Write a protein that binds this ligand. Structure first.
Ligand SMILES: [Mg+2]
Ligand SMILES: [Mg+2]
Ligand SMILES: [Mg+2]
Ligand SMILES: [Mg+2]
Ligand SMILES: [Mg+2]
Ligand SMILES: [Mg+2]
Ligand SMILES: [Mg+2]
Ligand SMILES: [Mg+2]
Ligand SMILES: [Mg+2]
Ligand SMILES: [Mg+2]
Ligand SMILES: [Mg+2]
Lengths: 127, 287, 59, 64, 95, 52
RNA sequence: GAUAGCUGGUUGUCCAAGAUAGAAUCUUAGUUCAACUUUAAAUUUGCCCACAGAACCAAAUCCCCUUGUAAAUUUAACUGU
RNA sequence: AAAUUUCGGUUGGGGCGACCUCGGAGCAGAACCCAACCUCCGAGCAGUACAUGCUAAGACUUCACCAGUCAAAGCGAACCU
């Protein structure tokens, strides 16, 4: 009805569509969502890694080899992250972690090293 | 109750049976007596008895405590730092549940002031209302919300529920007029036109991330999909709903009132509106 | 110590969710929060928050 | 700065019954008896200690 | 101090306190240790670090500063971006 | 006896610090740790503003 | 109706609690802080405590469980010393 | 030659003489504590690096405040009296 001076139609004569301003990986239906407060909410996510159709074979193999502590007894990559009061931030952090894992798959320890070296040295025992 | 049963008796309650609440009217304490005399609760000789002590904060002459501390720009530009009253998502849900601020109409500042959800004040360097991400969960409103400030978290929380988040800027005079439009109309002046933000808010309002009224409208779905992929939740196509034309209203700039336009003159008595004729007036108002 | 053979045994000839530990340390001391710290820095209030995020009452 | 109590400002009818009910309901929460202070005049009631959420839940369960 | 003004007939706030202190809704007064900008070459690093940190006020000092101010300064401060936004409200306290 | 001069930083402009030096000796060019670059850099004194 | 660290005075009945280490101050005839004292309130430990513990160039003192007790910390006030 | 102002404090009464900030020895002998016109010894600094860098749990604290003192860690280099 009314049209001001700096209306949206005049500021940008290219995208003048009235309904064009509301038009258009990691499937949500495949992943599981469940919360359990423990004072900070906890966003739990789980999904079968073997049947992950939305992940490539080498990426799945790398995720299963590296991130092995998160694998479930039934073959599910369980991961949780609780660092805020709201669950939306926790879900966003979990999604970002999943994306980082996928990307790095598509690509303190000195004591353990010394221990393994000493073990290998002591392994010397042949007839 | 027993109150009326007891009142049935006793004489009438005239003006002679009045008595204040025992413990409220503290008896006066005047200095006229043995205990309240001799010195009159003032002390021995000195300025205490004479009532002529130094100013407040004085410490006999030494550098007072409130001077020995150096200066600092704590409240330097405090008289100009923009301030907005917080608005929680839980507060919006409570308002929608209690009836006031119906979601069937745009959630403009006038509607919030009428419903009295966040009582703001035109004075006190206030230039609108901000948003808070308190009620991120258990929120289901679905309505075009208009707030000056808004974060990505709450923006997505509102969008996934079928809403439309937007941001605007109300000038001091425009904000005061929007706060109390009844006295503005009663004063007898034409509806002015809100000016543009300063250089500090131009880049903030000319971006599609925070949903601004001075950015490209084609970037809205891009930021929507970005926030969706960030926080999950598939975007519900608002184009395929029932209240599309109602939520499509964006309120063009230089328009203080969502319904009325600048230049028009409203009149309380005899509900009528005058047209701002004259080519010069129209050119100065809306070109 | 820990190894993959342990998990293999657990999931093969035990049939039970194996446990996991982390060795958690005791929480900090943090004495009784005084009303007027006087000489404490601005970080005094930071030791009693839950948690950093902007918390607002009702408005 | 120390004392902190709830206030049921709206009370109509027998206040002694409500006080006794609240006392019986709050006894298992602290073992002792809550120091109440009924006011027949102004239908009010004070209970030493914070019990806003618990009292609200109890009243909602009772149905008022 | 001026308990009563000569034009309107109200209290008056000493701008020195407002310039040398910072008001908070929690009821505490923030200040800055003196000597944080003079003779810094002879001060040991620990002293310089301790002097560059904020400090609170005592009960008597806080009450004096409050008396030297009006109710206008006790208003909230919902700044768009202020580093002291998470300090106006005090949480977790039991006497 | 020990003038207090300011040491200028070559790399990472905007960071300096003062040091002591005797009144009878060549200028100083000692190393110092910078906060911007987070590395050691040779400094150069310039402009004295003290006499003790 | 000037000011004045200074002299003088500051109106009826009765009940209760009610004596201070010091520092600064163009300051020791005056002021502030601290300390003593008063009011309403939330908390639990307040004092004599017993083995022991506490330095190279005499009467003593600090912590101190059971034991006598019911006193002590804090919050918000403010005059008085 | 006109116009405003002051002539700081201790002094076993006031001036004179001397002093005005801080550290130690006895008074103050065994946690702290206390007086100097009581008797003494010293200082407004002195020598090498410039990680004498950036951060931060908890404490002592000259009897108050302003002012001062120690510090697990965290990042960065190591293989002060
Ligand atoms: Mg009287
Ligand atoms: Mg002076
Ligand atoms: Mg007089
Ligand atoms: Mg005098
Ligand atoms: Mg006389
Ligand atoms: Mg008389
Ligand atoms: Mg008596
Ligand atoms: Mg002086
Ligand atoms: Mg004299
Ligand atoms: Mg002290
Ligand atoms: Mg270390």
């Amino acid at each position: 009805e009314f049209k001001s001076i700096y209306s949206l139609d005049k500021l940008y004569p290219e995208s003048q569509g009235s309904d064009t301003a509301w038009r258009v990986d990691i499937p949500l239906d495949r992943l599981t969502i469940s919360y359990c407060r423990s004072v900070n909410s906890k966003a739990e996510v789980r999904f079968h890694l073997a049947t992950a159709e939305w992940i490539a074979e080498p990426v799945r193999q790398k995720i299963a080899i590296t991130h092995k502590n998160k694998i479930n007894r039934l073959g599910e990559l369980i991961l949780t992250s609780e660092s805020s009061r709201y669950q939306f931030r926790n879900l966003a952090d979990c999604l970002q972690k999943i994306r980082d894992m996928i990307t790095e798959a598509s690509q303190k320890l000195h004591r353990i090293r010394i221990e393994n070296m000493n073990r290998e040295r002591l392994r010397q025992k042949r007839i | 109750a027993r109150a009326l049963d007891l009142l049935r008796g006793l004489p009438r309650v005239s003006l002679a049976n009045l008595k204040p609440n025992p413990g409220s009217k503290k008896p006066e304490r005047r200095p006229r007596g043995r205990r309240r005399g001799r010195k009159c609760g003032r002390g021995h000789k000195g300025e205490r008895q004479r009532g002529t002590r130094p100013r407040l904060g004085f410490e006999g002459g030494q550098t007072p405590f409130y001077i020995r501390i150096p200066k600092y720009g704590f409240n330097e530009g405090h008289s100009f730092r923009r301030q907005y009253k917080p608005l929680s998502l839980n507060r919006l849900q409570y308002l929608i549940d209690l009836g006031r601020v119906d979601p069937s109409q745009p959630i403009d500042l006038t509607q919030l002031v009428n419903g009295r959800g966040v009582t703001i004040q035109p004075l006190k360097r206030d230039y609108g209302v901000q948003l808070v991400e308190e009620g991120a969960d258990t929120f289901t409103a679905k309505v075009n919300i208009e707030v000056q400030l808004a974060s990505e978290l709450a923006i997505a929380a509102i969008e996934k529920n079928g809403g439309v988040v937007t941001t605007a800027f109300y000038d001091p005079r425009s904000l005061d007029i929007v706060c109390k439009p009844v006295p503005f109309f009663l004063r007898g002046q034409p509806i002015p036109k809100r000016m543009l933000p300063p250089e500090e808010l131009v880049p903030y309002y000319t971006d599609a991330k925070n949903r601004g009224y001075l950015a490209d409208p084609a970037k809205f779905p891009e930021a929507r999909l970005e926030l969706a992929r960030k926080y999950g939740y598939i975007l519900p196509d608002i184009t395929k709903d029932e209240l599309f034309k109602m939520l499509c209203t964006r309120k063009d700039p230089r328009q203080i009132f969502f319904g009325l336009a600048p230049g028009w003159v409203v009149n309380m008595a005899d509900k009528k509106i005058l047209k701002p004729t004259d080519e010069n007036l129209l050119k100065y108002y809306t070109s | 110590r820990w190894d993959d053979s342990v998990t293999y045994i657990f999931h093969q000839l035990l049939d039970m969710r194996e446990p996991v530990f982390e060795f958690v340390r005791p929480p900090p001391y943090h004495p009784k929060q005084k009303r007027f710290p006087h000489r404490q820095p601005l970080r005094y209030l930071d030791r009693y928050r839950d948690s950093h995020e902007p918390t607002y009452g009702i408005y | 700065g120390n004392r902190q109590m709830t206030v049921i400002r709206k009370v109509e009818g027998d206040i002694w019954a409500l006080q006794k009910d609240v006392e019986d309901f709050l006894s298992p929460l602290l073992g002792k008896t809550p120091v109440t202070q009924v006011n027949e005049v102004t239908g009010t009631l004070r209970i030493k200690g914070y019990f806003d959420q618990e009292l609200k839940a109890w009243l909602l369960e009772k149905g008022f | 101090l001026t308990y009563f003004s000569a034009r309107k007939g109200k209290r008056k706030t000493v701008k020195a306190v407002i310039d040398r202190f910072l008001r908070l809704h929690c009821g505490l007064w923030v200040r800055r240790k003196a000597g944080y900008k003079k003779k810094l070459w002879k001060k040991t690093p620990a002293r310089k670090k301790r002097l560059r940190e904020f400090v609170f006020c005592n009960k008597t000092q806080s009450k004096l500063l409050d008396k030297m101010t009006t109710s206008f300064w006790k208003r909230r401060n919902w700044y768009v971006d202020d580093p002291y936004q998470k300090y106006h409200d005090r949480t977790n306290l039991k006497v | 006896k020990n003038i207090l001069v300011r040491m200028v930083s070559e790399a990472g402009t905007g960071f300096c610090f003062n040091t002591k030096r005797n009144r009878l000796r060549e200028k100083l060019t000692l190393l110092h740790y910078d906060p911007v670059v987070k590395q050691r850099v040779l400094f150069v004194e310039k402009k004295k503003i003290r006499s003790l």
